[PDB]
Design a protein around this ligand. Structure first.
Ligand SMILES: CC(=O)N[C@H]1/C(=N/OC(=O)Nc2ccccc2)O[C@H](COS(=O)(=O)O)[C@@H](O)[C@@H]1O
Ligand SMILES: CC(=O)N[C@H]1/C(=N/OC(=O)Nc2ccccc2)O[C@H](COS(=O)(=O)O)[C@@H](O)[C@@H]1O
Ligand SMILES: [Ca+2]
Length: 819
């Protein structure tokens, strides 16, 4: 049973003819047309039950806000003596961002009912008529907009942004918690200060929040090694309680309990999402930050939630690695897998300190010789950038700082030194490694083999030579030492952050050719290498295509699955079922970021054609592995850098598909919903534009939205009356002309239109090609719009009195802001 929901709506319009009568609300009073409605004396009676709109260029719009979720079957509009000749009906969840539901609507006569039926009733909190053209110069006339449907009295859910989707979250009773400049934070333990620093690094710049450590503060962080959220874990659900946290907030207090220092950071990242997608603003905003009153109990399905980053094909400087860590942490990723060595590079300094007795190998040449090679454009005849890979390596100091920064964001480092294949950087770097059955051999009297095309995919370390395992052993110790120095500096506990795993690789031995005995090479190498890991009290990881050595690697070893169907992989099932192993899932088609993110893009096509956010979201790692939940550690995205030459171009591939993997890592199988996730991307995107992080503007995402934030104008330089008062964030702007910015000045003395200057440093571009080859940084997101007004002179030097009125209008966005 439907009804005209107009009578309980809060009505807004683009404007109105006269302040006296003909107000927008008179479209919403559910009154049947009067007798002789076309008569000037009926239509223009001072009390006629119709909206008379503003004049000017338009567009003219009439918007209803419903006290709840409306289910609308149809919209019936009784047009007056001036009718819309072109108009649309749009919905909004937030009241600022409008989506077309029906376009190409026309009235064709005065006092005419035009009925728009939805083939499926639409659920929304807002509906609006927007008209571009009308039948006369007279104000547009609406006797009635009847919105026929049912209302459900459900409030807006301020928990609706949280990604990943938490285990339990509900609104709590009362007003939200207001953050003031002096709001301090109390911690039960010093290992929770990294959680508070994460909040401080964002809220410091954005809202001017010091968040000083204090005693008896209204925001508390309590470490509780027994914190129990299993009350919220259904029979069909599964968690890793070590990363469990609860948040209970109200108008006076925010109470965080965390099972670990790691979960403290998770709790912090949830609070930052709740505050909103402007917390990473680079300018102090004018609006106050709120934490809504909520009740959260959260923990991740999977304990292993990672990204493989490959600097080996193309180096990433430390500052870029930090920028990836920030966004990994923001989505509660807890593992940074460093593929440090390849056929085309070694990316970390290894010194000659603390070698075994008898070991005179010069390890300094590894970085010196193989840090100065990279992926070669010329050895591709495709779309790959004209530029070779970035050369270089992290010094020991930088790598330690890399570890400390990861740790302070709750992310552990897992090193990979890939062998016995994908090992050419090791043979090119160390003369001593060129011995035994190593492939290829150096040329006559050359102590290292040449970096030439013929080496790629044919590398093998000497699986039969002692020196291979001596050198491997020394690299593991140096990595070990630098990671321990990294964690120490972090103040995070070694007991959470020191990941006792070493990744040996074992993938694609001799995929392009080589010297034969592929299986014998694998079994010997991963056997002996496996023992190096076991003796260092670590668990071995190998790629699934290395499980020729399934019997040789230690009991309880881990496979990282990436190629084929793990569920029907005999060697995977034997390791899981016969050798108490475990699995990390990185099936290419769901986790490999170089797989092109869309059919409009240029990139790798073999896994799916385009592996979209659907391919990254819509899979069950445990079912895909064909094993039981207990035997699945979790997941890893893979950033392989054959074709990657900048952070910007990496971020294009990483985002927002990484936020899908984060949800696969963390959220319960039965709380997964792709459409629900898809809806949350718009705010994810607003936060990314604030971070200055790039992302693919994927066509399957339907939640691309705009957002306005007032700037704290008192912190801004006035230059010639001109000052930054606002910022507008929307993915995909090729310019600002589609937006109309207006501002008015008034003091407590003297109404005056101020000149607005919208300033967007950069426009949105998709991938650009030159001579068939990807241009580096071709694909980039438009900037956030800096909204400047020019104040008059009389008001350039008037102390603050001056409240400002800023309006932003597009076909798909409207906001009026006031402070
Ligand atoms: C404020 C108002 O009522 N404006 C309406 C209007 N203005 O015209 C007059 O009121 N003028 C007038 C006419 C007769 C005697 C004395 C004065 O006319 C607009 C056009 O309406 S229509 O001809 O019926 O199409 C109307 O849209 C304005 O709201
Ligand atoms: C563990 C891993 O992924 N190894 C390499 C890799 N695997 O090779 C393939 O992708 N195989 C393949 C390629 C084309 C046709 C048929 C099979 O791929 C990584 C690159 O990933 S991708 O660009 O998304 O393909 C590579 O960097 C790894 O060394
Ligand atoms: Ca009416």
């Amino acid at each position: 049973t439907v009804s005209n929901l107009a009578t309980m709506a809060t009505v807004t319009a683009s404007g109105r003819e006269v302040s006296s009568g003909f107000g927008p609300e008179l479209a919403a009073d559910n009154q049947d047309l009067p007798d002789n409605p076309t008569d000037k004396s009926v239509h223009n009676a001072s009390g006629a039950s119709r909206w008379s709109a503003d004049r000017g260029s338009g567009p003219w719009w009439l918007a209803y806000e419903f006290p709840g979720e409306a289910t609308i079957s149809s919209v019936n509009i009784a047009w007056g003596n001036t009718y819309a000749t072109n108009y649309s009906i749009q919905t909004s969840d937030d009241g600022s961002n409008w989506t077309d539901v029906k376009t190409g609507l026309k009235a064709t006569a005065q006092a005419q009912w035009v009925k728009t039926t939805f083939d499926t009733p639409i659920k929304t909190r807002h509906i609006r008529m927007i008209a571009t053209t009308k039948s006369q110069s007279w104000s547009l006339s609406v006797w009635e907009m009847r919105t026929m449907g049912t209302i459900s009295a459900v409030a807006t859910d301020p928990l609706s942004r949280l990604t990943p989707r938490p285990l339990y979250a509900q609104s709590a009773d009362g007003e939200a918690f207001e953050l003031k400049k002096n709001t301090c934070v109390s911690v039960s333990d010093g290992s929770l200060l990294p959680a508070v620093d994460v909040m401080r690094d964002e809220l410091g710049t954005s809202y001017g929040l010091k968040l000083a450590e204090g005693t008896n503060c209204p925001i508390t962080f309590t470490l509780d090694e027994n914190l129990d959220v299993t009350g919220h874990v259904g029979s069909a659900q599964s968690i890793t309680a070590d990363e469990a946290y609860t948040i209970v907030s109200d108008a006076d207090s925010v109470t965080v309990k965390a099972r670990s220092a790691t979960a403290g950071i998770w709790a912090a990242q949830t609070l930052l999402q709740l505050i909103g997608p402007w917390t990473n603003s680079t300018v102090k905003l004018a609006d106050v930050a709120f934490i809504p009153a909520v009740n959260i109990a959260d923990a991740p399905r999977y304990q292993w939630r990672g990204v493989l980053v490959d600097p080996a094909r193309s180096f990433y400087p430390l500052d870029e690695m930090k920028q990836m860590i920030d966004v990994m942490s923001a989505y509660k990723m807890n593992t940074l897998h460093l593929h440090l060595s390849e056929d085309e590079g070694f990316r970390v300094e290894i010194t000659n300190d603390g070698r075994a007795d008898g070991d005179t190998t010069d390890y300094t040449q590894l970085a010196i010789k193989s840090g100065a090679i990279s992926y070669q454009s010329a050895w591709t005849s495709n779309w790959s950038p004209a530029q070779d890979g970035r050369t270089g390596y992290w010094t020991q100091s930088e790598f330690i700082e890399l570890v400390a920064y990861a740790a302070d964001h709750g992310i552990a480092i897992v090193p990979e030194i890939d062998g016995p294949g994908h090992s050419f950087s090791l043979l090119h770097g160390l003369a001593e490694l060129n011995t035994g059955n190593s492939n290829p051999k150096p040329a006559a009297g050359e102590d290292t083999p040449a970096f030439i095309q013929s080496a790629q995919g044919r590398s093998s370390l000497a699986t039969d030579a002692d020196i291979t395992y001596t050198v491997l052993g020394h690299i593991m110790d140096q990595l070990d030492g630098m990671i321990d120095k990294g964690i120490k500096a972090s103040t995070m506990p070694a007991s959470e952050l020191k990941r006792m795993y070493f990744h040996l690789g074992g993938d694609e031995l001799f995929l392009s050719g080589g010297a034969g005995n592929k299986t014998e090479r694998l079994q010997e190498y991963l056997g002996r290498s496996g023992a190096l890991v076991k003796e260092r009290d670590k668990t071995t990881i190998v790629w699934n295509d290395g499980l020729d050595a399934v019997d040789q690697i230690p009991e309880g070893s881990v496979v990282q699955h990436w190629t084929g169907n793990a569920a029907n992989n005999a060697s995977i099932q034997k390791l899981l079922n016969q050798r108490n192993g475990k699995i990390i899932m990185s099936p290419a088609g769901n986790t490999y970021f170089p797989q092109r993110p869309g059919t409009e893009t240029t990139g790798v096509t073999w896994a799916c054609g385009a592996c979209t956010t659907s391919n990254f979201y819509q899979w069950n790692p445990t079912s895909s592995a064909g094993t039981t939940e207990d035997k699945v550690l979790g997941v890893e995205d893979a950033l392989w850098s054959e074709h990657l030459r900048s952070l910007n171009d990496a971020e294009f591939l990483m985002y927002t598909r990484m936020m899908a993997t984060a949800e696969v890592g963390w959220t319960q199988q039965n709380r997964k919903d792709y459409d629900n996730w898809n809806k949350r991307v718009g705010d994810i995107a607003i936060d990314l534009m604030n971070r200055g992080a790039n992302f693919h503007k994927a066509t399957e995402v339907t939640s691309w939205k705009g957002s306005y934030a007032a700037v704290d104008a008192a912190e801004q330089k006035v230059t010639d009356g001109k000052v930054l008062v606002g910022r507008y964030a929307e993915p995909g702007l090729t310019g600002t002309d589609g937006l109309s910015f207006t501002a008015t000045y008034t003091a407590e003395g003297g109404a005056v239109n101020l000149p607005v200057t919208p300033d967007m440093k950069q426009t949105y571009s998709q991938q650009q090609l030159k001579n068939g080859r990807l241009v580096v940084n071709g694909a980039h997101m438009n900037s956030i719009v800096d909204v400047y007004v020019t104040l008059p002179s009389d008001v350039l030097a008037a102390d603050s009195v001056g409240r400002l009125d800023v309006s932003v209008s597009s076909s798909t966005y409207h906001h009026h802001h006031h402070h």
